[PDB]
Design a protein around this motif. Structure first.
Motif, PDB file in Angstrom:
ATOM      1  N   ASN A 264      -5.318  -0.991   5.824  1.00  0.00           N
ATOM      2  CA  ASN A 264      -5.985  -1.023   7.121  1.00  0.00           C
ATOM      3  C   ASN A 264      -6.817  -2.285   7.290  1.00  0.00           C
ATOM      4  OD1 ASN A 264      -4.876   1.375   7.903  1.00  0.00           O
ATOM      5  ND2 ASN A 264      -6.764   2.574   7.763  1.00  0.00           N
TER       6      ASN A 264
ATOM      7  N   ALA B 199      -6.470  -2.584  11.215  1.00  0.00           N
ATOM      8  CA  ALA B 199      -5.921  -1.411  11.874  1.00  0.00           C
ATOM      9  C   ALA B 199      -6.976  -0.721  12.728  1.00  0.00           C
ATOM     10  CB  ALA B 199      -5.359  -0.445  10.835  1.00  0.00           C
ATOM     11  N   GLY B 200      -6.645  -0.517  14.001  1.00  0.00           N
ATOM     12  CA  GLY B 200      -7.542   0.154  14.919  1.00  0.00           C
ATOM     13  C   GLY B 200      -6.836   1.329  15.553  1.00  0.00           C
TER      14      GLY B 200
ATOM     15  N   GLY C  51       3.322   1.563   2.229  1.00  0.00           N
ATOM     16  CA  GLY C  51       4.534   1.203   2.936  1.00  0.00           C
ATOM     17  C   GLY C  51       4.598   1.700   4.358  1.00  0.00           C
ATOM     18  N   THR C  52       3.482   1.656   5.081  1.00  0.00           N
ATOM     19  CA  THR C  52       3.368   2.379   6.340  1.00  0.00           C
ATOM     20  C   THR C  52       3.477   1.435   7.538  1.00  0.00           C
ATOM     21  OG1 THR C  52       2.128   4.170   5.279  1.00  0.00           O
ATOM     22  CG2 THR C  52       1.712   3.861   7.593  1.00  0.00           C
TER      23      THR C  52
ATOM     24  N   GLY D 146       0.817  -1.195   0.000  1.00  0.00           N
ATOM     25  CA  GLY D 146       0.000   0.000   0.000  1.00  0.00           C
ATOM     26  C   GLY D 146       0.855   1.250   0.000  1.00  0.00           C
TER      27      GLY D 146
ATOM     28  N   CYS E  34       5.059  -5.813   4.361  1.00  0.00           N
ATOM     29  CA  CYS E  34       5.054  -5.610   2.917  1.00  0.00           C
ATOM     30  C   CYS E  34       6.445  -5.673   2.300  1.00  0.00           C
ATOM     31  CB  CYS E  34       4.400  -4.269   2.577  1.00  0.00           C
ATOM     32  SG  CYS E  34       5.363  -2.811   3.035  1.00  0.00           S
TER      33      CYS E  34
ATOM     34  N   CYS F 211      -4.767 -13.290  -0.156  1.00  0.00           N
ATOM     35  CA  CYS F 211      -5.319 -12.807  -1.414  1.00  0.00           C
ATOM     36  C   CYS F 211      -4.996 -11.330  -1.571  1.00  0.00           C
ATOM     37  CB  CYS F 211      -6.830 -13.030  -1.480  1.00  0.00           C
ATOM     38  SG  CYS F 211      -7.670 -12.574   0.037  1.00  0.00           S
ATOM     39  N   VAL F 212      -5.374 -10.788  -2.723  1.00  0.00           N
ATOM     40  CA  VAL F 212      -5.172  -9.372  -3.013  1.00  0.00           C
ATOM     41  C   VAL F 212      -6.526  -8.678  -3.048  1.00  0.00           C
ATOM     42  CG1 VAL F 212      -3.997  -7.744  -4.516  1.00  0.00           C
ATOM     43  CG2 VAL F 212      -3.232 -10.125  -4.424  1.00  0.00           C
TER      44      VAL F 212
ATOM     45  N   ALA G 199      -7.102  -0.607   2.092  1.00  0.00           N
ATOM     46  CA  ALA G 199      -6.891  -2.051   2.055  1.00  0.00           C
ATOM     47  C   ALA G 199      -5.685  -2.469   2.885  1.00  0.00           C
ATOM     48  CB  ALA G 199      -6.726  -2.528   0.617  1.00  0.00           C
TER      49      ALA G 199
HETATM   50  C1  LIG Z   1       3.333   6.950  12.489  1.00  0.00           C
HETATM   51  C2  LIG Z   1       2.501   5.715  12.353  1.00  0.00           C
HETATM   52  C3  LIG Z   1       1.379   5.567  13.111  1.00  0.00           C
HETATM   53  C4  LIG Z   1       0.599   4.423  13.004  1.00  0.00           C
HETATM   54  N1  LIG Z   1      -0.501   4.321  13.783  1.00  0.00           N
HETATM   55  C5  LIG Z   1      -1.190   3.249  13.673  1.00  0.00           C
HETATM   56  C6  LIG Z   1      -2.292   3.088  14.440  1.00  0.00           C
HETATM   57  O1  LIG Z   1      -2.650   3.893  15.242  1.00  0.00           O
HETATM   58  N2  LIG Z   1      -3.004   1.960  14.316  1.00  0.00           N
HETATM   59  C7  LIG Z   1      -2.655   1.060  13.506  1.00  0.00           C
HETATM   60  O2  LIG Z   1      -3.337   0.134  13.479  1.00  0.00           O
HETATM   61  N3  LIG Z   1      -1.649   1.135  12.711  1.00  0.00           N
HETATM   62  C8  LIG Z   1      -0.903   2.190  12.774  1.00  0.00           C
HETATM   63  N4  LIG Z   1       0.171   2.326  11.973  1.00  0.00           N
HETATM   64  C9  LIG Z   1       0.554   1.255  11.054  1.00  0.00           C
HETATM   65  C10 LIG Z   1      -0.564   0.744  10.246  1.00  0.00           C
HETATM   66  O3  LIG Z   1      -0.513  -0.604  10.016  1.00  0.00           O
HETATM   67  C11 LIG Z   1      -0.348   1.252   8.860  1.00  0.00           C
HETATM   68  O4  LIG Z   1      -0.452   2.613   9.005  1.00  0.00           O
HETATM   69  C12 LIG Z   1      -1.331   0.661   7.853  1.00  0.00           C
HETATM   70  O5  LIG Z   1      -2.184  -0.277   8.463  1.00  0.00           O
HETATM   71  C13 LIG Z   1      -0.652  -0.079   6.747  1.00  0.00           C
HETATM   72  O6  LIG Z   1      -1.220   0.451   5.570  1.00  0.00           O
HETATM   73  P1  LIG Z   1      -0.321   0.726   4.380  1.00  0.00           P
HETATM   74  O7  LIG Z   1      -1.188   1.215   3.352  1.00  0.00           O
HETATM   75  O8  LIG Z   1       0.615   1.620   5.023  1.00  0.00           O
HETATM   76  O9  LIG Z   1       0.207  -0.707   4.170  1.00  0.00           O
HETATM   77  P2  LIG Z   1       1.455  -1.520   3.830  1.00  0.00           P
HETATM   78  O10 LIG Z   1       2.414  -1.502   4.894  1.00  0.00           O
HETATM   79  O11 LIG Z   1       1.896  -1.157   2.511  1.00  0.00           O
HETATM   80  O12 LIG Z   1       0.789  -2.874   3.836  1.00  0.00           O
HETATM   81  C14 LIG Z   1       0.597  -3.442   5.099  1.00  0.00           C
HETATM   82  C15 LIG Z   1       0.174  -4.859   4.875  1.00  0.00           C
HETATM   83  O13 LIG Z   1      -1.016  -4.851   4.076  1.00  0.00           O
HETATM   84  C16 LIG Z   1      -0.842  -5.590   2.911  1.00  0.00           C
HETATM   85  N5  LIG Z   1      -1.631  -4.995   1.903  1.00  0.00           N
HETATM   86  C17 LIG Z   1      -1.681  -3.743   1.537  1.00  0.00           C
HETATM   87  N6  LIG Z   1      -2.517  -3.535   0.569  1.00  0.00           N
HETATM   88  C18 LIG Z   1      -3.077  -4.761   0.313  1.00  0.00           C
HETATM   89  C19 LIG Z   1      -4.049  -5.230  -0.574  1.00  0.00           C
HETATM   90  N7  LIG Z   1      -4.667  -4.493  -1.470  1.00  0.00           N
HETATM   91  N8  LIG Z   1      -4.352  -6.533  -0.531  1.00  0.00           N
HETATM   92  C20 LIG Z   1      -3.734  -7.297   0.350  1.00  0.00           C
HETATM   93  N9  LIG Z   1      -2.819  -6.952   1.225  1.00  0.00           N
HETATM   94  C21 LIG Z   1      -2.537  -5.661   1.159  1.00  0.00           C
HETATM   95  C22 LIG Z   1       0.637  -5.522   2.666  1.00  0.00           C
HETATM   96  O14 LIG Z   1       1.003  -6.581   1.840  1.00  0.00           O
HETATM   97  C23 LIG Z   1       1.130  -5.718   4.079  1.00  0.00           C
HETATM   98  O15 LIG Z   1       0.772  -7.029   4.411  1.00  0.00           O
HETATM   99  C24 LIG Z   1       0.957   3.448  12.077  1.00  0.00           C
HETATM  100  C25 LIG Z   1       2.092   3.643  11.302  1.00  0.00           C
HETATM  101  C26 LIG Z   1       2.837   4.750  11.422  1.00  0.00           C
HETATM  102  C27 LIG Z   1       4.063   4.901  10.576  1.00  0.00           C
END
Ligand SMILES: Cc1cc2nc3c(=O)[nH]c(=O)nc-3n(C[C@H](O)[C@H](O)[C@H](O)COP(=O)(O)OP(=O)(O)OC[C@H]3O[C@@H](n4cnc5c(N)ncnc54)[C@H](O)[C@@H]3O)c2cc1C
Ligand SMILES: Cc1cc2nc3c(=O)[nH]c(=O)nc-3n(C[C@H](O)[C@H](O)[C@H](O)COP(=O)(O)OP(=O)(O)OC[C@H]3O[C@@H](n4cnc5c(N)ncnc54)[C@H](O)[C@@H]3O)c2cc1C
Ligand SMILES: Cc1cc2nc3c(=O)[nH]c(=O)nc-3n(C[C@H](O)[C@H](O)[C@H](O)COP(=O)(O)OP(=O)(O)OC[C@H]3O[C@@H](n4cnc5c(N)ncnc54)[C@H](O)[C@@H]3O)c2cc1C
Ligand SMILES: Cc1cc2nc3c(=O)[nH]c(=O)nc-3n(C[C@H](O)[C@H](O)[C@H](O)COP(=O)(O)OP(=O)(O)OC[C@H]3O[C@@H](n4cnc5c(N)ncnc54)[C@H](O)[C@@H]3O)c2cc1C
Ligand SMILES: [Fe+3]
Lengths: 467, 265, 467, 265
Positions: free
Chosen positions: A147, A152-153, A77-78, A75, A84, A207-208, A145
Motif C-alpha cells: 500500500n 493506495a487510497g 500479488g494484489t 507483497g 510486481c 528501494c525495498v 508496504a
Molecule cells: C479486488 C481489488 C481491489 C482493490 N482495491 C484497491 C483500492 O481500492 N485502492 C487501491 O489503491 N488499490 C486497490 N487494489 C490494488 C492495490 O494496489 C493492491 O491491493 C495493493 O496496493 C498492492 O499490495 P500488494 O501487497 O498486493 O502488492 P504487490 O502487488 O505484491 O506489490 C505492488 C507493488 O508494490 C511493490 N512492493 C510490495 N512490497 C514492497 C516492499 N516491501 N518494498 C518495495 N516495494 C514493494 C511491488 O514490487 C509492486 O511494485 C485492489 C486490488 C484488488 C485485486
C-alpha cells in the motif's frame, strides 16, 4: 541490458545467506508468483526468496548488485497494473512471512509494522486498542508496504486521505544493500529532501521497504450512512461541493448509477433497498456520540432536499448498512461475473469534472457497442471504469479495447486529470504516463531511479522505465 | 387488503449478549435499541400490498414508552397510523400473555383484513407470538411465507415453505400471516417523511383500561404459564483432532464423525 | 566550482529579456537582499531581478544555464537558516512582484497563487470567501512559495498539518529553463514519482516555483481557548496523549513555562492572567456552533482536572484571547529584547520525549551559565529553543554557542528526533544534518540535486551540499 | 474592605454595529453577549482587595433574565454572591434611571464598604453611571483609579489620573470607586469553580416590589430625562491629498494641516 541469468552457482551462494526452506527454484515456484491481478503479463522469476528480516534483504541486495541480477519485490500479488511481475526473471523477494506488528506506541499514536502485515490484520489489531488506521483500499489482503509502494487510497480519502498522509517513517534497503532510515516517530519534518515521499508511490523501483511507522487516529464510535437518490449523475456529482462547504464532512462519498446497481442485484441475489432512480449518492458520517452524528447528517439531509433530491434515506442500522454496503462492496465482483474478461481504468479528474466524464463513458459505450460500467468516489474525483469484453472475438476485442482505453485516457488529459489515482502505473499504464507528462517530466523520474539504482536492478521497465 | 395490521417490536440493537455469573440479568452493552430486522420484512410485505390494493396500514407494538420510537420509525417507511400498548401491568409477559394483549389491542382498533407478524424477534427467538395471536383472534394463519402469488381483494395466494417443499395455499380474509427472512428487500426510512409535521399519525396509546377484557389476571406476569429459571452462556468447546494413516483408516474416522453429527455420510 | 562572474555583457543581455526597471546592479541592490533573518552570513548578488511571470523566469534560467551563472531565488528574505543567501553572488530572482491570486475555485476548494503572494493576504482573501488555509507559520509576511520550499508549519499542525499537506499542484522551472507542471486540482495522485513532494522542502535547490495550487478547507466559525496550569513541564507534556485519545482534537497545543512568560510580561508591559504556576498548556478548539465547541472543551477540561491539573481557565471572549495569545505571540520578540544577540534551534523530537528535552535544556543552561529560554508546540514535538549571549565577550560567546548547540543537536539525535521541523536546514544546519543522517543518506540527496540541476547552479552549498 | 459591591453589565459580544437606514434599531450581528471588559478590571480590583482584607464580594447587575449569565461568569472568577435587578418596569432607562435602580438595589442588599464600578460600558460609552449612583447613595466617589497604594481597613489610598497629572487621595469607607482600563490583568473564569455543582451562591433576583422606594415614576423610561431621537452611522471621509514643491511650500502646508487639526505645530 547486461542482466546475468541465475545459474546453479548463484543458487548455492543464495542458500548460504537464506535457509533453504525459504528459497524456491524452478518447478517449486508456483503459478501465483508469475503474475498479479492484471492478468495480461506472465513472467516467472528464477529464484523466489521469502525473506524474514531487514538484514536478510540487505544480504540479497548486496549479492544481486555484485552479480548484476534484477530484483522484484512482491507483497500479496494484489496490484492491478503488473508492477510486481519479474519481466527479466531474476530474484523475487517475497515479504508475506514478515507479518509481525513490532510495536504499538500509544503515546505517539504510531504503530511499527513489518512489510507483509496484511491490511485486514493491521486494522483489526489497532481497532482492538481503540485506534484507527484510516486508509482503506478495497482489497484487505494487501501488504502494508504494498500500500505504501503504490500509494493506495480508498473510500475514506475525502475526509482522511491516502496512505501517504499516514507514513511516518520507513526503513528501506537500497539496491547496493545499504540500510536507510527515512522518517521516525516525529510529526514535523523539514530536514532535507523528503526521500520518504519518493518511496511512497515508487512501486518497488527505488528501494525495498523493510519497516514502516504508521500514524494512527483515535477510533470513532458511531457511524451513520445516508442514501440520496437523484435524477441523473450530473445532479448527484454537483451536490458534493455544497456538502463539504456545509462543514459536515462525510467519511465516504460514493456515486453509483442504476446500471451498476443492477449488476450487484444479480450477483448477490437481493434487490437494492430503493432503485426507483437513476443515480445515487451514498454518504457516511462518523463520530463519538449519537447526537453529534445526528447533527452532521441532518445538516446534509436538510441541504440535499433543497437542491432537487427525490428523497433522503437514513441508513442507521447494522442490517441496513449491510444491505447497502454489500451492494457497493460487490460492484467489482458483479462486473467480473457478467463478462468474459475486462480491463480496468482508474483515472482521477477534477471534482467538478466527474459528471462530464461519466456522461462521456455513456456516449463512448453506445458508439463502440461495448459495455462500460463505472463507479467511483465523488468526493475526490477517482473513477473506477471497466471496459467489458462480453462476446467479442480476440481480434475485435483487442481493437475495441485499445480504442476505448486511448479515448478515455486522452479525455482525462483534456480534463486536466491524471492517469491513475489509486492503482498506480506499473507496466500497463506506462504509455499513458508518457502522453500525460512530457519527456522532460519522465527524464526527471528516470534520473531519480538512476540515483537510487544506477545498475537498474530494482524492478527494470516499470512506471517511468521505457514509458 | 384495505386494513392491514403490522406487529413490530423494539429489540436490543445488537445480540452480542453475555450474562454476569451472579447477577442473573443480561450483560447488555448499551441501549441503542432498534426495530428488529425480521419485522422489516413484515412491514415491506404490507407496503407491496398497499401499492396493489390501496388500503391503510396500522402498526402495533407492545412494550414501554421507549417502544414509541419504532412506531415513529415505521412511519418514516410509510405506515399510516400506529398504536402503542404501554402499561405497567403488561410487563414480564411470555408468548401466551404477549399474544393475548396484542389480540386485545387488535379488537380495540377494529377489524383488519390482514395481520402481518414477523418471523421471530432477536431477543426471544421463540417465533410463536404470531400463531398464538391468531388463536385468540380466531382467524386463520399461515406461517413462513416466502412469496405472495396473488393479492386479490378477497384473500391471498401464498407460498408457505417447509424444509424441503413449497405449499401453495389460498387463504381468505381476515387472516394472519407470518413472513420469514428475505421475502423482499425492506425500504429505508425516508428523511423527507420525517420532516412532514414530525409525522402526520400521532401514536394512540392503550392501557388495560382500554381493552375489552379489563382483567389483569390474563396479562403480564400473572397470565404467564412459563418463567425463566436461570440464564447462562452456552458451553462450546473447540477440539483440534488430527488423523493420519491413509487408506480407509481415515475414511472410517470421517464416517465416524459424520454419523456422530447425524449427517449419515 | 568554475562559476562565471557576471560581467557587463551579461547585464546587457539580461536587460533585453527583462525590462530595466526590474533589474538592479551594484549599488542599486539594497542591503536587505544580502541576508535573511539568520544574520550570520552576508553575501551580495551581482544581479537582482524582480520577475513577474513564468516565462520571464524561464528566460533567465535559460541564460544562466548556458553561461554557468548561479541562481538564488528569494521570497521575503524571512527564512532563518541562510537559505536564500547568494554565497557565490550570481543572479538573484526576487518574487515579491508576483503577488497575484490567480483563481479561487469554490467547487474544488482550491486557490491558485503566484509565488510572492504573502501569507497575510492569502489568508485574508480566503477567509472573506468563508474558506480556510490551515498552515500558520509565525511570520505572516512570508511568501507562499517560501512556505512551500521550506515546508513551513506552525501552531495548527496538531490538527491540520503543515504546508506539504495542502499543496495540490506546482508549476516549476528547472535549471535549464524547462517548465514543468507537477500536480493539479485533483485530490488523489498515484501517477509516477511524487516530484511535487521533493520540491516541498527543497529550499530552492531543485527548481523555481512559479505557480501553486493550494487546498482549502471550510472556515470554522467559532474558536475557544483553554489555559491549564501544571506543576512542572513533565505534567504539562504528559497530558497531550490523553487529550488526543479523548477524540476532542485541539487546534493548537502550546506549552509555556513561567520564565518564558516573564519575558513577555516585561516586553508587553502587561501581566499574564495567571502566573501562579510553573508550566502551562494553552489549547484551542474550533467549531461551527457554540454547543459543538462546548462539548469539545468540557471533555478535555474534565480530563485535565482528573489528571493533576491545578485549574482550568476558560478563554472565550476576544479580549481574553488577546490577553493570552498576545503573550504567546510575543515570546520571540521578548527573548530578542532581553539579550544582545541570540541563536536558535527548532529540533523536533518524539512527543513523549518533549519533557525530557526541556528538562535537559534547564540542566544545560545551569551548567554552561547561559540563558536558554524555550517554548514550542506540545502536540507535535517541535521545540523552539534560543541560546542568548547576554553579556559574554566575543571569543567566549562563540565557544559557548558552539558547545550548547552541539550538545542539543546530539541529544535530539539520541532521542531519535531530527535537526529541524519548521525552519529547515539551509546554510546554518548543514553540519548537524550530516551528523544525523549518514553519508549514504546525503549522497542520495546530492544525487537528486544532480538530476534536477546537473551544472549545480540553483542555490549551491545549501541543505545537502558540503554538509 | 469586608463588604464589596461590584456593578457589572452584560453587553453585546462585539461592538461592530451598523444601523438599517429605516428601521431605527441597530443591526447587531448576533447575540453572543458577554461581560464588558471594563468591568473585568472592576472585578479584578475587588479580588486583590479581598486577598488583602478578607471580606466578601457581591456582584450586582441590572437587565433582563439573560443578564444572569454574567452573574454566573463573575462567580467563576471568584465572586461570593450575586443579585439581578430584573423587572419589566426597569427597561428603557438612561443613566439617571439606571443609577437610581442600582442605588435602590444597593440599599436593599445592605451596607457595603466599597462599591466598584467599571470605567464605562461598550454599548453606551457614557462612563457616568458610577458618579450618578454614588450621588443617590450619598457616598464619596473617585473616578479613573489606576493604582491602589494602600488598602487599610478604614479607607483606601488611591491614585486618580487626569490627562497630565496623578492625584493621590485618601478616601474613607463607605465610598464608590471607578477603575479604568489596565489597572490589573483580570483573571480568567475557572472551570473548576464552575464544576462544584452549579454555583455556591444563588442569584437573588429583585423587582420593583423589593425596593424601598416602590414607585415606578422614578424607574425605567418614566424616570428618564433623556431619550434617543435617531441613530445613524458616523460620516467619515478619506481624502488623499498630495503636496509637492520643496522648501517651506510643504512646511506651510504641514503647519496648515496641524493647526486645522488643533495640534498647533
Ligand atoms: C479486488 C481489488 C481491489 C482493490 N482495491 C484497491 C483500492 O481500492 N485502492 C487501491 O489503491 N488499490 C486497490 N487494489 C490494488 C492495490 O494496489 C493492491 O491491493 C495493493 O496496493 C498492492 O499490495 P500488494 O501487497 O498486493 O502488492 P504487490 O502487488 O505484491 O506489490 C505492488 C507493488 O508494490 C511493490 N512492493 C510490495 N512490497 C514492497 C516492499 N516491501 N518494498 C518495495 N516495494 C514493494 C511491488 O514490487 C509492486 O511494485 C485492489 C486490488 C484488488 C485485486
Ligand atoms: C431468554 C428468553 C427466553 C424466553 N423463552 C420463552 C419460552 O420458552 N417460551 C415463552 O412462551 N416465552 C419465552 N420468553 C418470553 C417471550 O419470548 C418474550 O419475553 C416476549 O414475549 C417477546 O416475544 P417473542 O420474542 O417470543 O416473540 P416472537 O414469537 O419471537 O416474535 C414473533 C413476532 O411477533 C411479534 N411480536 C413479538 N413480541 C411483540 C411485542 N412485544 N409487541 C409487538 N409485536 C410483537 C413480532 O411481529 C415478531 O416478529 C423468553 C424470553 C427471554 C428473554
Ligand atoms: C519571526 C519569524 C517567525 C517565523 N516563524 C516561523 C514559523 O512559525 N514556522 C516556520 O516554519 N517558519 C517560520 N519562520 C521562517 C519561515 O521559513 C519563513 O518565514 C518562510 O518560510 C520563508 O519564506 P520567505 O518568503 O520569507 O522566504 P525566503 O527566505 O526568501 O526563502 C526561503 C527559501 O525559499 C526559497 N524560495 C523562496 N521562494 C522560492 C520560489 N519561488 N521557488 C523556489 N524557492 C523559493 C529561497 O530560495 C530559500 O530557499 C519565521 C521567521 C521569522 C522571521
Ligand atoms: C446609543 C446610546 C446612547 C445613549 N446616550 C445616552 C446619553 O447621552 N445620556 C444618558 O443619560 N443615557 C444615554 N444612554 C442610555 C444609557 O447609556 C444606557 O442605555 C444604559 O443606561 C447603560 O448605561 P451606560 O452604558 O451609560 O453605563 P456607563 O456609565 O457607560 O457604565 C459605567 C459603569 O456602570 C455600571 N453599569 C452601567 N450600566 C449598568 C447596568 N445596567 N447594570 C449594572 N451596572 C451597570 C458598570 O459597572 C459600568 O462599567 C444611551 C444609550 C444608547 C444605546
Ligand atoms: Fe477507488
Amino acid at each position: 541490458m547486461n542482466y546475468k541469468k541465475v545459474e546453479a552457482s548463484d543458487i548455492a551462494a543464495i542458500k548460504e545467506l537464506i535457509p533453504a526452506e525459504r528459497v524456491f527454484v524452478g518447478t517449486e515456484i508456483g503459478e501465483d508468483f508469475s503474475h498479479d491481478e492484471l492478468g495480461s503479463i506472465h513472467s516467472y522469476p528464477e529464484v523466489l526468496i521469502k525473506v524474514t528480516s531487514t538484514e536478510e534483504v540487505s544480504k540479497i541486495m548486496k549479492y544481486a548488485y555484485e552479480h548484476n541480477i534484477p530484483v522484484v519485490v512482491r507483497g500479496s500479488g494484489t496490484g492491478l497494473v503488473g508492477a510486481c511481475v519479474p519481466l527479466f526473471g531474476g530474484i523475487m523477494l517475497e515479504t508475506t512471512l514478515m507479518n509481525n506488528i513490532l510495536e504499538l506506541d500509544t503515546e505517539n499514536l504510531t504503530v511499527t509494522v513489518e512489510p507483509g502485515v496484511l491490511l485486514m490484520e493491521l486494522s483489526k489489531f489497532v481497532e482492538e486498542n481503540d485506534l484507527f488506521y484510516p486508509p482503506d483500499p478495497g482489497e484487505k489482503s494487501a501488504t502494508i508496504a504494498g500500500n505504501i509502494s503504490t500509494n493506495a487510497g480508498g473510500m475514506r480519502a475525502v475526509k482522511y486521505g491516502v496512505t501517504r498522509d499516514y507514513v511516518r517513517g520507513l526503513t528501506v534497503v537500497l539496491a547496493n544493500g545499504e540500510i536507510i532510515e527515512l522518517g521516525g516517530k516525529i510529526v514535523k519534518n523539514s530536514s532535507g529532501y523528503s526521500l520518504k515521499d519518493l518511496v511512497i508511490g515508487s512501486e518497488g523501483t527505488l528501494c525495498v521497504i523493510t519497516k514502516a511507522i504508521l500514524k494512527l487516529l483515535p477510533l470513532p464510535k458511531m457511524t451513520l450512512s445516508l442514501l440520496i437518490p437523484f435524477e441523473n449523475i450530473s445532479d448527484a456529482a454537483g451536490i458534493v461541493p455544497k456538502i463539504i462547504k456545509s462543514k459536515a464532512i462525510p467519511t465516504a462519498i460514493e456515486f453509483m448509477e442504476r446500471q451498476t446497481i443492477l449488476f450487484a442485484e444479480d450477483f448477490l441475489g437481493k434487490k437494492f433497498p430503493d432503485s426507483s432512480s437513476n443515480a445515487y449518492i451514498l454518504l457516511t458520517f462518523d463520530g463519538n456520540t449519537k447526537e453529534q452524528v445526528e447533527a452532521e447528517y441532518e445538516t446534509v439531509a436538510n441541504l440535499c432536499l433543497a437542491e432537487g433530491a427525490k428523497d433522503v434515506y437514513i441508513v442507521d442500522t447494522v442490517e441496513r448498512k449491510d444491505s447497502v454496503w454489500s451492494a457497493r462492496g460487490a460492484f467489482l465482483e458483479a462486473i467480473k461475473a457478467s463478462t468474459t474478461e475486462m480491463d480496468e481504468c482508474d483515472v482521477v479528474v477534477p471534482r467538478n469534472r466527474i459528471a462530464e466524464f461519466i456522461e462521456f463513458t455513456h456516449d463512448l459505450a453506445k458508439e463502440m457497442d461495448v459495455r462500460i460500467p463505472s463507479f467511483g468516489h465523488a468526493g475526490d474525483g477517482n473513477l473506477h471504469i471497466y471496459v467489458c469484453r462480453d462476446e467479442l472475438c480476440q481480434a475485435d476485442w483487442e481493437a475495441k479495447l485499445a480504442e476505448a482505453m486511448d479515448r478515455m485516457y486522452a479525455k482525462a488529459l483534456t480534463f486536466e486529470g491524471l492517469v491513475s489515482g489509486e492503482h498506480g502505473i506499473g507496466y500497463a499504464k506506462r504509455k499513458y504516463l508518457l502522453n500525460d507528462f512530457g519527456t522532460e517530466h519522465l527524464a526527471l523520474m528516470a534520473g531519480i531511479k538512476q540515483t537510487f539504482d544506477p545498475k537498474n536492478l530494482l524492478n527494470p521497465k516499470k512506471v517511468c522505465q521505457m514509458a | 387488503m384495505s386494513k392491514i395490521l403490522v406487529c413490530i417490536k423494539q429489540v436490543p440493537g445488537t445480540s452480542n449478549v453475555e450474562v454476569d455469573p451472579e447477577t442473573g440479568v443480561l450483560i447488555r452493552d448499551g441501549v441503542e435499541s432498534k426495530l428488529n430486522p425480521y419485522d422489516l420484512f413484515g412491514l415491506e410485505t404490507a407496503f407491496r400490498l398497499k401499492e396493489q390494493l390501496g388500503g391503510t396500514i396500522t402498526t402495533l407494538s407492545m412494550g414501554p414508552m421507549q417502544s414509541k420510537e419504532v412506531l415513529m420509525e415505521s412511519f418514516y417507511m410509510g405506515a399510516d397510523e400506529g398504536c402503542l400498548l404501554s402499561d405497567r401491568k403488561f410487563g414480564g409477559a411470555d408468548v401466551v400473555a404477549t399474544s393475548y394483549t396484542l389480540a386485545q389491542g387488535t379488537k380495540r382498533l377494529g377489524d383488519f383484513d390482514l395481520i402481518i407478524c414477523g418471523k421471530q424477534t432477536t431477543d426471544g427467538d421463540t417465533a410463536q407470538v404470531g400463531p398464538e395471536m391468531a388463536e385468540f383472534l380466531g382467524i386463520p394463519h399461515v406461517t413462513n411465507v416466502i412469496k405472495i402469488l396473488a393479492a386479490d381483494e378477497k384473500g391471498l395466494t401464498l407460498q408457505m415453505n417447509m424444509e424441503e417443499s413449497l405449499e401453495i395455499q389460498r387463504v381468505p380474509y381476515p387472516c394472519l400471516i407470518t413472513v420469514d427472512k428475505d421475502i423482499y428487500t425492506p425500504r429505508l426510512p425516508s428523511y423527507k417523511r420525517k420532516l412532514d409535521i414530525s409525522k402526520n399519525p400521532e401514536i394512540k396509546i392503550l392501557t388495560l383500561k382500554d381493552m375489552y377484557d379489563t382483567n389483569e389476571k390474563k396479562y403480564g406476569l400473572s397470565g404467564s404459564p412459563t418463567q425463566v429459571e436461570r440464564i447462562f452462556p452456552p458451553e462450546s468447546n473447540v477440539e483440534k483432532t488430527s488423523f493420519e494413516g491413509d487408506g480407509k483408516v481415515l475414511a472410517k474416522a470421517l464416517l465416524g464423525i459424520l454419523t456422530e453429527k447425524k449427517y449419515l455420510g
